[PDB]
A paper describes a structure:
The highly acidic environment (pH 1) in the stomach is generated by the gastric proton pump, H+,K+-ATPase, which mediates an exchange of H+ and K+ across the parietal cell membrane that is coupled with ATP hydrolysis. The H+,K+-ATPase consists of two subunits. The α-subunit is composed of 10 transmembrane (TM) helices, in which the cation-binding sites are located, and three cytoplasmic domains (the nucleotide (N), phosphorylation (P) and actuator (A) domains) that catalyze ATP hydrolysis and the auto-phosphorylation reaction. The β-subunit is a single-span membrane protein with a short N-terminal cytoplasmic tail and a large C-terminal ectodomain, and it is involved in correct membrane integration and targeting of the complex to the cell surface.
As expected, the crystals were significantly improved when using the Tyr799Trp mutant, which provided a 2.5 Å resolution structure in the best case [Y799W(K+)E2-MgFx]. The overall structure of H+,K+-ATPase Y799W(K+)E2-MgFx is very close to the corresponding structure of Na+,K+-ATPase. However, instead of having two K+ ions occluded in the transmembrane cation-binding site of the Na+,K+-ATPase, only a single K+ is observed in the cation-binding site of H+,K+-ATPase. Unlike the previously reported Rb+-bound and luminal-open (SCH)E2BeFx structure of H+,K+-ATPase, in the Y799W(K+)E2-MgFx state, the cation-binding site is tightly shielded from the luminal solution by an extensive hydrophobic cluster centered around Tyr799Trp at the luminal gate. A hydrogen bond between the nitrogen of the Trp799 residue and main chain carbonyl oxygen of Leu811 (3.3 Å) provides for the positioning of a Trp rotamer suitable for hydrophobic interactions with its surroundings, and stabilizes its conformation. The bound single K+ in H+,K+-ATPase is located at a position corresponding to site II of the Na+,K+-ATPase (2K+)E2-MgFx state. The bound K+ is coordinated by eight oxygen atoms located within 4 Å. Of these, five make a large contribution to K+ coordination (within 3 Å); they include three oxygen atoms from main-chain carbonyls (Val338, Ala339 and Val341) and two from side-chain carboxyl groups (Glu343 and Glu795). The total valence for the bound K+ is 1.05 (optimal valence for K+ is 1.00), indicating that the K+ is almost ideally coordinated by the surrounding oxygen atoms. The relatively distant location of Glu820 from the bound K+ is due to a salt bridge with Lys791.
Author numbering:
A (entry chain B): 29 to 290
B (entry chain A): 47 to 1033
Write the structure that this text describes.
Amino acid sequence: MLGRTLSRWVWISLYYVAFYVVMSGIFALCIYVLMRTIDPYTPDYQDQLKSPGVTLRPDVYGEKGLDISYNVSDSTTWAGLAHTLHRFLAGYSPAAQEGSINCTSEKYFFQESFLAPNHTKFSCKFTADMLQNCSGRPDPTFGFAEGKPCFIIKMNRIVKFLPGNSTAPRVDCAFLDQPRDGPPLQVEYFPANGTYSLHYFPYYGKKAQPHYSNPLVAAKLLNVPRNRDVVIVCKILAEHVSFDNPHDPYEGKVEFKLKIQK
Amino acid sequence: AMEINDHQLSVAELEQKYQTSATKGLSASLAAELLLRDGPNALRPPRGTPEYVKFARQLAGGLQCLMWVAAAICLIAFAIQASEGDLTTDDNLYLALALIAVVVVTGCFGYYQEFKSTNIIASFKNLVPQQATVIRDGDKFQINADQLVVGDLVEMKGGDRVPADIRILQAQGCKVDNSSLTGESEPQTRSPECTHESPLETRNIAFFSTMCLEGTAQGLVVNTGDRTIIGRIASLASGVENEKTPIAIEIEHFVDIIAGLAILFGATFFIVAMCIGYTFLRAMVFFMAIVVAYVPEGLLATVTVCLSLTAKRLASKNCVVKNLEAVETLGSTSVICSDKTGTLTQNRMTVSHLWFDNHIHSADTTEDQSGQTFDQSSETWRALCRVLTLCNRAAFKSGQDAVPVPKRIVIGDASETALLKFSELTLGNAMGYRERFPKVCEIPFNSTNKFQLSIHTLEDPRDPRHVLVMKGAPERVLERCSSILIKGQELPLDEQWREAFQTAYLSLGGLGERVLGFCQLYLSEKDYPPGYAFDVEAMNFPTSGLCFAGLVSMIDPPRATVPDAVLKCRTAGIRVIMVTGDHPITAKAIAASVGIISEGSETVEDIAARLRVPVDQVNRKDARACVINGMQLKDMDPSELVEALRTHPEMVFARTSPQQKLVIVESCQRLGAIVAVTGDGVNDSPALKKADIGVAMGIAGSDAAKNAADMILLDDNFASIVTGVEQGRLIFDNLKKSIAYTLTKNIPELTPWLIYITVSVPLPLGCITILFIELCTDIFPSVSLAYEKAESDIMHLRPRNPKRDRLVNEPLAAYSYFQIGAIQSFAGFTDYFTAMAQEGWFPLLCVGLRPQWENHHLQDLQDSYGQEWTFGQRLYQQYTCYTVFFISIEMCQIADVLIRKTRRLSAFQQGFFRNRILVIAIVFQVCIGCFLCYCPGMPNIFNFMPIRFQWWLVPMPFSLLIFVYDEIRKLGVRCCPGSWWDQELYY
Ligand SMILES: CCCCCCCC/C=C\CCCCCCCC(=O)OC[C@H](COP(=O)(O)OCC[N+](C)(C)C)OC(=O)CCCCCCC/C=C/CCCCCCCC
Ligand SMILES: CCCCCCCC/C=C\CCCCCCCC(=O)OC[C@H](COP(=O)(O)OCC[N+](C)(C)C)OC(=O)CCCCCCC/C=C\CCCCCCCC
Ligand SMILES: CCCCCCCCCCCCOCCOCCOCCOCCOCCOCCOCCOCCO
Ligand SMILES: CC(C)CCC[C@@H](C)[C@H]1CC[C@H]2[C@@H]3CC=C4C[C@@H](O)CC[C@]4(C)[C@H]3CC[C@]12C
Ligand SMILES: *[C@@H]1O[C@H](CO)[C@@H](O)[C@H](O)[C@H]1NC(C)=O
Ligand SMILES: *[C@@H]1O[C@H](CO)[C@@H](O)[C@H](O)[C@H]1NC(C)=O
Ligand SMILES: *[C@@H]1O[C@H](CO)[C@@H](O)[C@H](O)[C@H]1NC(C)=O
Ligand SMILES: *[C@@H]1O[C@H](CO)[C@@H](O)[C@H](O)[C@H]1NC(C)=O
Ligand SMILES: [K+]
Ligand SMILES: [K+]
Ligand SMILES: [K+]
Ligand SMILES: [K+]
Ligand SMILES: [K+]
Ligand SMILES: [K+]
Ligand SMILES: [Mg+2]
């Protein structure tokens, strides 16, 4: 008898598992009730999503941040960059975009009923060719070979978030530290003016827009000096987008180290 | 065997034993060799362990060591992940530091429990003379006492302290104070005569440090240093193994339960961790987190705060503790061994009885005159009171009229001092009365006359006669009387009166009291004119055929509050044993008066006398009481001492040596008793050290007794023992409520890590937040259970069985951990998922989500809705998880502390709000909570988020469930005492 008799060893066990079943049962029911208060289309609260994050492809990380470095002379130092850039643009082929439709409105695309197939809302196409020179055609190297590389700037999507309708939200890239000897960062954006069209908003969530695709803007850096370390900051200029958070450097902004070796 | 035998040797043998001279002393040289052979004649001070090294082992021990290991890992992690430039994990620095602070702050809590830390031998060296007069080479001179050696020839005079243990060869009217040996300051005669077997009672040994009260003597130094009787008493005081108090035992018990369970939980999951694919360094960190979760970092601290609030309460009743452990022990005590003189008694000789008018009257002997008085309407009494008043030479010192007559300081012997205070208390003013009857002649008490006498003018102007008044030993006073005062008349002393006298006299003697006879005689003017010349050496006056007035007897009486205090303890299941250096007859009388011996109890010698049958045949079992003296005790085996302790529940040990007290204490301890000792004298310090708690009288106490004791009664009020028993029983019952409350929340601190590891959902509860709960939000409410009143009538309960009734036993733990702690854990997870799902993360998506969640290269993770999230945003939502789990536990700790108010009573019977400090603690809990949540800045400093009102409500159905569940459990056990429900689900 290992601390009590073996008949009492059993009636204790039964109680504890019964207790544990009831409690488990009670908990399971709480989660079920919870999943009925929950709307499958719109989150109850978006406390941590007041402003959208920003990200950039190709995303290569060094220590404590985004760090990108290649050699124009050795095409194999940028092979992977172009490759993940190409591989990323795959979901933006015209074929991958068959689920979403043309948007010409250049205004917010409000859908309150589900007219798209299988009881969904429509989403707007965005095809790789909208990035033009930085689409992989006719330059499959995305501007890396010529030392004027394209970086793709994507905005995190948030259900029902409206960025501001006085104009389209734009991207702007400049040097973090503008070199005293240097000129400003000279950049050409695709589409023109680095804008995301208004139609792509609001996002209605993965269940309402399963084929939704984030619009993109490519930043073709024309200025950047060879064999030097620089830092580029790309900010989203929109009425409802902020980029001042010191505890989230990816809020409304994205920064990266760059060095183009020769 | 260093026992003195030199009292039984002749001078021839003593000179040969010590190579000395009984008149010329040792040679100068040999005393210098002997000095180098034996060392100084001084008490060797054993230094206890250094103050700093006692603080060190306060940093070891079960929980302290786990904390050490945990901070070790946090430092290493903070090392490995800064040797590769990762700055985010400075938490693992702060984590290590905070833990190290907890280790150190806890270590202080165990060290500042010891208030005094004064040496015991400091007081013993203080009882030792600095100088002596020695004779060496027939030159008498004064030497340092530490230069004395066995063989030295020493001179003692009255007023100086005796410079070693000494075999007396010559003495002129020499008397000593042996209170440090016997506890009694009655002066003992020293002669060169061998008057006893034991060197402790023979007249021709005098002891180092004892005061020579009067006379002169010479003698041979027979022991020095630690070999003296006082050195051996001091050795026994300091060199006692420092055993753990009953509560220290109990605390280390539950620490060893927890440190084991922590190690189980940590190590089995470290294996699970590695088994499920984590790296070694990551499992090593889980082990640290699990230990931080499961171990109760603030528990030891709450315990010493609870003791402190008992110490404070005790202190307010003039009962002072020297270490907070001692604040419990009387609660667990089952045997009290008590000194008599100055402990149970006042150490003040007092008028106790009177024989007059052929009846024995009882005087009120209490120090506050709160007792029952005697009949004073008699005219025989008025006469006897005039005799004992005029025939006294003592006097009160000037201007003490604001002092109570018992406390006042009298110039005289103990006897006369007793009669004078008795006078002042029955009359208005004894010294003034005395002045109204001027003394015209006197014989002070003398060894030849064997009595004291004086003759007096009378106050009344009209009456010119002189009154002779005389006191002395009763038989010797009686043999000089021819008449006696009985009921208003004066009667010739026939054989029936002389026999009546002898009976009263031996009766008062049988009460352990000292007796004096008192007689008078009115001298006629016709033979003695108003100016008659009363010459002492002429003896013109008669001195025979006087009128006997009465007997007066005296005793060292109980303190007033002591007889009821002793009944209280017995009523509480505590055995009470008298252990005294005094003589047995007196000891038995006081034992009976105080209730150590109940009315009706008989010794085997008592029964033997009633049946007029010899003692050999009395059935030992049939005697409830027993009186054993020091000699009998020295004769017994230990199998015999335990057989006597078991046989007679009312036990008196008289005429015991200090070692004999300690031997009796430890005899009870070996039997399973938690033993307290109450005393006051140097002779009690060894027993005081050896007791599980030693209590000393603050006023009557000697320094050795106070410094050996663990508790001091500043007002000398023995009834404070009764308080101590109660508060001790309260603290223990309340500590287990507090501890139960503190432990139960360790489980929902733990289970989030178990799910985090084995399910890889995002981390529900961080280490920093845990510390805030363990060290801050929950600390006041656990402490407020100190103020919980008794559920039952505790002072009528038996003392607890220290083997079966522990502070924390398996029922308390399992219930707290694996039933209530589990309810809390379920609450927590319920809020966690509610807060996650309401923020975009459905439960099924959290499973396996940890890696992408905690990935700094992933700034666009998609939630259940497809929304994209940065690490930052995810991190804050992780904090929102911490915070929602934190309030799930706090809310449940409200229910918890309410169900810990009572272990058996319902909350509806004794009410929810009687304990007022608890509610203040509950309110302060919620405030510091709201502060942590809603003070701006908190998210970036302590990872606390201002949660939505809904996530405070989510766990309240669980708390209400905790109250209802325990409320019914406690109902079940009141309604079913013998049932399974009690035997298993009562804690
Ligand atoms: C000592 C022994 C202890 C034993 C402890 C046992 C703990 C486990 C207990 C129960 C297991 C989980 C119960 C889950 C119940 C689910 C009920 C349910 O039907 O809900 C539905 C969800 C799916 O939602 P949906 O796709 O329909 O939503 C779509 C939204 N709409 C509906 C609006 C369209 O089903 C689901 O989530 C399924 C996934 C459930 C999530 C897994 C959570 C894992 C966390 C466990 C922590 C437990 C801590 C226990 C502490 C014990 C202390 C000792
Ligand atoms: C005396 C002590 C007794 C010890 C008890 C041992 C009994 C249980 C032991 C094994 C049970 C089954 C083990 C399954 C076989 C190995 C599975 C495995 O090799 O998976 C390793 C995974 C990592 O692989 P990944 O694909 O996630 O890598 C992602 C790579 N990246 C991060 C770059 C994206 O580890 C992770 O980090 C996250 C885990 C994800 C994989 C699911 C496995 C969870 C299933 C069961 C665990 C429950 C055990 C609890 C036992 C409780 C006892 C009280
Ligand atoms: C038998 C006993 C068992 C039962 C036990 C019951 C326990 C009862 C305990 C009662 C506790 C009461 O708790 C009060 C909690 O107050 C929460 C306040 O909620 C505020 C909701 O607001 C949501 C916060 O949203 C974040 C953004 O806030 C925007 C507005 O901010 C205005 C300025 O405030 C700054 C901080 O929010
Ligand atoms: C719920 C399921 C998954 C777990 C069941 C495991 C069993 C074996 C565990 C869970 C709770 C455990 C009990 C918890 C409480 C007690 C009471 C204590 O005085 C002795 C140990 C004992 C009796 C434990 C024995 C083992 C135990 C019964
Ligand atoms: C739902 O509709 C979509 C339309 O894009 C179709 O591709 C898919 O096969 C349908 N699935 C079901 C289960 O009806
Ligand atoms: C984009 O492509 C067109 C066509 O070759 C060319 O004229 C233009 O200069 C290109 N822009 C850049 C920045 O290369
Ligand atoms: C912008 O949006 C608001 C919606 O509140 C709409 O009423 C307004 O007409 C819009 N204005 C422009 C210039 O797009
Ligand atoms: C780039 O590559 C060429 C040859 O492939 C090499 O000579 C040169 O040093 C490289 N650039 C740097 C900065 O190393
Ligand atoms: K803890
Ligand atoms: K005196
Ligand atoms: K007179
Ligand atoms: K004393
Ligand atoms: K002691
Ligand atoms: K002891
Ligand atoms: Mg005494």
